[PDB]
Amino acid sequence: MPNFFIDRPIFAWVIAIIIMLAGGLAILKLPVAQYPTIAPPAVTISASYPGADAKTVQDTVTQVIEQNMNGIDNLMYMSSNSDSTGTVQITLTFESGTDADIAQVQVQNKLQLAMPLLPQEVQQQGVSVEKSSSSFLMVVGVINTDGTMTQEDISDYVAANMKDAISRTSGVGDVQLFGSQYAMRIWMNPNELNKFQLTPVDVITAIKAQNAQVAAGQLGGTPPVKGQQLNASIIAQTRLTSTEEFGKILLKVNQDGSRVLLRDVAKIELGGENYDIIAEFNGQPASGLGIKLATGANALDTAAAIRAELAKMEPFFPSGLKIVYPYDTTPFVKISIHEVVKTLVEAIILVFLVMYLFLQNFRATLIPTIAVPVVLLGTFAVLAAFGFSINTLTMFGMVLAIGLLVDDAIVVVENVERVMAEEGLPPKEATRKSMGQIQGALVGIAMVLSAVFVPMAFFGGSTGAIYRQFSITIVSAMALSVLVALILTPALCATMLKPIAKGDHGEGKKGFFGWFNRMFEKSTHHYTDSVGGILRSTGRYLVLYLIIVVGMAYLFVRLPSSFLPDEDQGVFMTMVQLPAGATQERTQKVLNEVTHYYLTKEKNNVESVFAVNGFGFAPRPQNTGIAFVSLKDWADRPGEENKVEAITMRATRAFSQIKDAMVFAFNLPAIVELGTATGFDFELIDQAGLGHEKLTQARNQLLAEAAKHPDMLTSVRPNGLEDTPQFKIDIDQEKAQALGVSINDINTTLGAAWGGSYVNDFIDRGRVKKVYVMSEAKYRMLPDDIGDWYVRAADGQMVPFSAFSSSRWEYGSPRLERYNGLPSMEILGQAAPGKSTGEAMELMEQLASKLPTGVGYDWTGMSYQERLSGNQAPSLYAISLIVVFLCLAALYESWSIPFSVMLVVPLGVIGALLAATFRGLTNDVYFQVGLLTTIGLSAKNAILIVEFAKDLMDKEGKGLIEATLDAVRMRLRPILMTSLAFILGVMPLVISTGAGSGAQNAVGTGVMGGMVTATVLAIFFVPVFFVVVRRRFS
Amino acid sequence: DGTMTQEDISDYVAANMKDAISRTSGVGDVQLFGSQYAMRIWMNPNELNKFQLTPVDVITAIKAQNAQVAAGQLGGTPPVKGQQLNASIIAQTRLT
Amino acid sequence: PGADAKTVQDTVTQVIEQNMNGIDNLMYMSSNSDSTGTVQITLTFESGTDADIAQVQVQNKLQLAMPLLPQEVQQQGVSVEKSSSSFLMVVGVINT
Amino acid sequence: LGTATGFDFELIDQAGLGHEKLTQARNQLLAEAAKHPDMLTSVRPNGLEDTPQFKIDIDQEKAQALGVSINDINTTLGAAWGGSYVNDFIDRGRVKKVYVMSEAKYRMLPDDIGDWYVRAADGQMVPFSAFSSSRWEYGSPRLERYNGLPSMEILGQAAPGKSTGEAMELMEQLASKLPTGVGYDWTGMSYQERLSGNQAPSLYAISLIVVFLCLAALYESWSIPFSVMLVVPLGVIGAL
Ligand SMILES: CO[C@H]1/C=C/O[C@@]2(C)Oc3c(C)c(O)c4c(O)c(c(C=O)c(O)c4c3C2=O)NC(=O)/C(C)=C\C=C\[C@H](C)[C@H](O)[C@@H](C)[C@@H](O)[C@@H](C)[C@H](OC(C)=O)[C@@H]1C
Ligand SMILES: CO[C@H]1/C=C/O[C@@]2(C)Oc3c(C)c(O)c4c(O)c(c(C=O)c(O)c4c3C2=O)NC(=O)/C(C)=C\C=C\[C@H](C)[C@H](O)[C@@H](C)[C@@H](O)[C@@H](C)[C@H](OC(C)=O)[C@@H]1C
Ligand SMILES: CCCCCCCCCCCCO[C@@H]1O[C@H](CO)[C@@H](O[C@H]2O[C@H](CO)[C@@H](O)[C@H](O)[C@H]2O)[C@H](O)[C@H]1O
Ligand SMILES: CCCCCCCCCCCCO[C@@H]1O[C@H](CO)[C@@H](O[C@H]2O[C@H](CO)[C@@H](O)[C@H](O)[C@H]2O)[C@H](O)[C@H]1O
Ligand SMILES: CCCCCCCCCCCCO[C@@H]1O[C@H](CO)[C@@H](O[C@H]2O[C@H](CO)[C@@H](O)[C@H](O)[C@H]2O)[C@H](O)[C@H]1O
Ligand SMILES: CCCCCCCCCC[N+](C)(C)[O-]
Ligand SMILES: CCCCCCCCCCCC
Ligand SMILES: CCCCCCCCCCCC
């Protein structure tokens, strides 16, 4: 194949171009992400029971729905929450690989059996089934710069003109309105209602009757009479459109003939469906859309489509209304990937310079510099075929690949330039001879190297999909690299390499190059003279090698391990959690303090703050709040102290002062669904119908016991709310029966007044919206206001609530949790410093075993994936070692000689561990995959040295020591050519600061440190390994 | 130990075992060989006839007196600003 | 039955349209509401979209919008079918 | 497919202006389009015009004063005049619908409205004429919506010797001079022609580049391929 393309350079060029077109066309069409989607699919059922307490919701909705959730494929677990706001949220989590489309269809197929058993009020609020991520992709804030519109006016506009179109955009799994759409608010007055002897029941009946859309048929409608000439639609009652129209709804005509209108017994205004969520952007009033990414959907592509839909709306905004972007997770992905693309382009340039230093011919320098772009672009085409995406790991696979790509090129170019220098053949014949003697080793090496990376594509579950990206990328690159090294690189050598005279090693060149050539030829002569002496010792360096393996073993064992570094993403969140029973006003006091801190203290770092009252992870009215903090560009805030980790740790420390409120600023982890580094997610189960009060006691007992082990467990706390005072009112059925008052009228009057009642729909400026009846605030604030509410008996007399009701204060849950259909209580916590999660969970199980009768436990979220198959690194690298040995045994046709290559592994590991240890890095994904790359090159170096030596001993019949010296003499220039080119190519990564520098620093440090030790040691030790091994086995 | 009848076993299976098994991996349809407990009101027509009542009166009463009412909140949104108390109103719960 | 364009639009078309969220690969959506007492909402999807998945996601979002439609419309039923103007043939049945 | 020159335009109410103001905005666009016969042909709405409809107002006060329930009134009207699907029945083993409606001769003209009586609480039969007033108004017998918002579909095509892309560009220009809140969008063939027309250049290019490169490999020269590639017009001329 080399011989063919040496005679056909234009053919070789055509293949390279087609590969680059395929690669180029792939880059335009390939999806872009931060990581591959490893998170398990989650379908969330959300229903709303207006005016319902936590238990009413649980025992009429949650349980009824949960009991129908059965025969659902690939279901891991099912958590549910039933809170005092009237909300239920059942999350069904599915196995990794589950089709989210089918999971939704199945979950919804079962919910459809439960729907008819649910209350009519819960049905009419719409039960939603959604397949989205639990955290926000972005937040689209909307403000008024002219201050022409209030917080409510903006919220209604966003809901009525923007919300729906965004919800229908592909990849948008869920959209949360930070505010409420307007409804027709009928604020009932009990003084006026009783005065005219009317109830909330009469108001609801009147609205339904007089806010009706009546289908009245047609004049001359079919079937018609003969000779009918007129056909016209009959328009009867239509929906009311204004506060005024609702105002003049006739409730009753008094005996004297005077009219009682709805406005005579109620304040009628346009106002939110609910008054629970109130948002502020940089202190001023705002609304917006919390957009959640659909399961398996592309963040960047979806974010783009969202922005495209917002661009359509902007032209038709009212005066002053303006979109702001106070939280976006996509820009980091778009910018952090561009930073890795930049270090790729920089490495290709930094290669060209080191390539020009040695070849010293602009045309010869391009042969390795052309090969790299062709393979990398080629790899993008292979990714596309295999259905992978342009993510951080694939993009870093390309960066680490560059090392393996130039070596293939350098080996081919260097060996041709040598052949010409030793014999004085023309470029075409020198290439033909050169390709003839290394093409076998190149193809063979790629199979030996593939046995290093292929194994880490066979890791299990979520953590395995991460490694499989690097593996397939690097392996695809090597496959193309060898293919390009047999098609193109030979053809380019034959045409572009300058004819070199016999005995011309430069030296005769004038200037810098002249000095360099003489300095290198004496360095080569010194090196060969130096190695000559090393081999006469042998025993000295075998004792020195055993020291390095012990030093390696020591550093590796003490060096801590992680998964993926926490990156500054130019965004973070602050959670505000007050004790349940705390008011909207008290939460806003804390949110103001949080917003104040970021706008005053962190004005240098923080760009914007989007604070939301009555929202957190989900809507949790009154006692809960969240702040979305977007920072300034990474360039505008240099140093560790101005990065998210420092900012949030200062913020948490500052917010610890705040009273009767838990306030935490936290960075979003590398992957949310893997949780913290050493945290656990524990579930306490009621297995014997003990009840909530007994389960609360069982939890308190466990938490108390967990506190008595600070040595093992750190900050073990519940992920729920505590019981609060609740107003228990008993309706005396006998007294109600005696006075002639129906319980329907009683319950409707209480619920409609204090809870609110969704009557029917109306048309607000051409859009269908809700009509809500409810007590005016001032008549539903005090317990004593209960007696102000009158119900009409059958005999016509108005009866106060005080007449047929008794009340008392009691305690109950504002948020009832269930796990796998049983009453539960989520408990979070991490292992104490030094102790592992496995040791911590073991103690939690032990402590949980001592709990009262009927109390079980379980592990969920991150803890579920931990007790699942893990720690399979010894297994897969035991195989890798065995396969690498066998592959070398086939190459050299020897069971013994492979050891001469396999003993160089530690020479590269020691450098990685030293550099990683000294810079305070950890044994993470980026360190491991960068170490495999270093082991790959140092092994590839060792293969060619032993190959040349063995070839001399077999083909030329030269002696062991003479062959070793002659081998290392020819295999020095190409080794140092690769080391410099790769060490200098990953300099940008090591010094890197800005977006995604955490990964770059981690990749670059482990590689640079390794390559340094892997080069200087190998050139002296590979000879010692070959001579020791060949002597030992004869 | 003969402390549970066919009915008692069937309820425990239906109420504590069936649902968790029906959600286990690879499990399709789950048929209960028995019945879960319901609240059984066994009506006597002679006693109903005596007090001039029907199954209609019994149903109407059970729906009225075995109700789970959504009764709203004290100090709920929108509140009168300065409100300190925010408490759920618990009306009728299900009979147990 | 007996509904004007406005009545259909403001009780059926708008309610259904408002609930057509979280459906994958939707390009655009169009609807008619006329005095023949009929509404027809057409959802056109991206080329290569599984029409079965497209249809099931639409009828599922409709199922949860059904309780918000009038009794008269719920009773009649709301059909969700794959759009097609291409017949193999039209068999005419006549009485001579 | 429709027509290749034909476009499919959607005039959109983006600010809750109403049906009537969207009708006026459409009439304005239809008029301006007619003032460019050189570019646009048969610019016409794919919709129905407003028609006379019989607006009847039930007086709530007279109904409540006469003891006539509004429910019985709106049922009597809807059931008689519009028809009402009551429940099902089995005809020869097939479940079929039961419909109550007025016999044609009692639901033809406005004069028939007063012949329909509703029973009051006191059992007296009150005619519709007693508690109702009627007038003529205009309304839509077919209300269109596009992407959730009120719309009006406009059909048309590029005039003789003009491209479909040119006609669209003018329709967009004329649309940018319509009342505040009146937006527009492309649908059907127009939506697809915009997307499928965007990628046409890239394919034509990729085709020529790969053909060239393939001939270059065959002949081992960058020059000779042109000798082959120059043939393209010799076939196209005769076809045309
Ligand atoms: C480790 O996890 C963290 C971040 C996940 O990242 C997110 C994006 O993913 C989350 C998931 C999957 C949840 O389940 C959450 C949750 O249940 C919360 C809160 C909100 O606090 C949350 O905020 C989340 C939450 C996230 O932000 N609890 C509630 O809403 C309710 C009803 C009550 C609150 C109880 C206390 C106050 C809470 O337990 C507190 C003691 C801490 O333990 C948490 C705030 C944790 O903060 C940290 C840094 O210790 C987060 C769960
Ligand atoms: C190129 O297209 C043609 C035929 C397709 O062949 C068929 C088989 O396929 C059709 C399709 C895909 C439609 O969308 C139709 C349509 O929307 C219609 C009418 C019914 O006319 C139709 O009849 C069709 C129709 C066909 O018969 N409009 C309506 O019903 C409504 C609600 C209002 C009508 C408004 C006017 C009156 C109409 O716009 C008129 C001005 C012309 O524009 C059309 C009649 C076009 O004729 C011509 C001559 O240019 C057809 C769209
Ligand atoms: C020699 C070094 C080789 C290494 C090259 C590495 C480059 C990798 C870049 C990946 C990140 C950017 O990937 C980004 O993807 C989007 C996806 O639509 C592309 O978007 C593209 O959309 C359409 C597709 O027909 C094109 O007409 C348009 O010109 C282009 O913008 C961007 O042009 C590209 O910038
Ligand atoms: C299905 C599982 C299979 C997995 C096995 C694959 C891994 C094996 C890797 C070995 C790589 C091949 O290594 C191969 O070794 C032989 C000597 O033994 C070399 O040399 C031999 O073949 C060349 C081919 O032109 C000839 O000159 C001559 O027959 C001999 O010298 C090859 O040039 C080299 O390419
Ligand atoms: C630097 C950290 C520790 C890691 C060490 C690995 C890197 C090695 C760096 C290069 C060392 C080369 O050092 C080399 O040592 C050998 C002996 O061992 C010397 O050789 C000398 O001793 C030998 C042994 O008796 C004699 O046969 C020889 O005639 C004499 O010159 C070489 O003259 C010297 O060049
Ligand atoms: C890094 C540069 C160190 C000295 C370089 C010497 C350059 C001089 C060129 C050769 N000379 C003029 C001495 O013959
Ligand atoms: C990017 C295209 C590179 C073209 C290089 C051409 C050199 C080979 C031609 C040989 C002429 C005899
Ligand atoms: C060389 C590429 C092989 C592809 C690897 C797929 C294996 C998936 C691992 C799942 C195990 C739980």
Residue numbers in the entry:
A (entry chain A): 1 to 1034
B (entry chain C): 146 to 241
C (entry chain B): 50 to 145
D (entry chain B): 674 to 913
Provide excerpts from the study.
The E. coli AcrAB-TolC drug efflux pump contains the inner membrane H+/drug antiporter AcrB comprising three functionally interdependent protomers, cycling consecutively through the loose (L), tight (T) and open (O) state during cooperative catalysis. AcrB is the homotrimeric IM proton-motive force-driven H+/drug antiporter component which recognizes and actively transports multiple drugs (antibiotics, detergents, dyes, and solvents) via the tightly connected AcrA and TolC channels across the OM, leading to an observable resistance phenotype. Four different entry channels (CH1–CH4) have been described with putative entrances from the periplasm or the outer leaflet of the IM toward the two drug-binding pockets, the access pocket (AP) and deep binding pocket (DBP) inside the AcrB pump. Here, we present 13 X-ray structures of AcrB in intermediate states of the transport cycle.
In an attempt to prevent ansamycin binding, we made the switch loop more rigid by Gly619 and/or Gly621 to Pro substitutions. Surprisingly, the crystal structure of these variants showed propensity to bind either 3-FOR to both L protomer AP and the smaller AP in the T protomer in the same AcrB trimer or two rifabutin (RFB) molecules to the AP of the T protomer. We assume that the Gly619Pro and Gly621Pro substitutions induce a switch loop conformation mimicking a transition state during wild-type L to T conformer conversion while the HMW drug is bound to the AP. During the L to T transition, the HMW drug accommodates in the AP/DBP region, mediated by the flexible switch loop of the T protomer, in an induced fit manner. The intermediate positions of the ansamycins observed in these structures appears to precede the binding to the DBP as has been shown for erythromycin in the MtrD homolog RND pump from Neisseria gonorrhoeae.
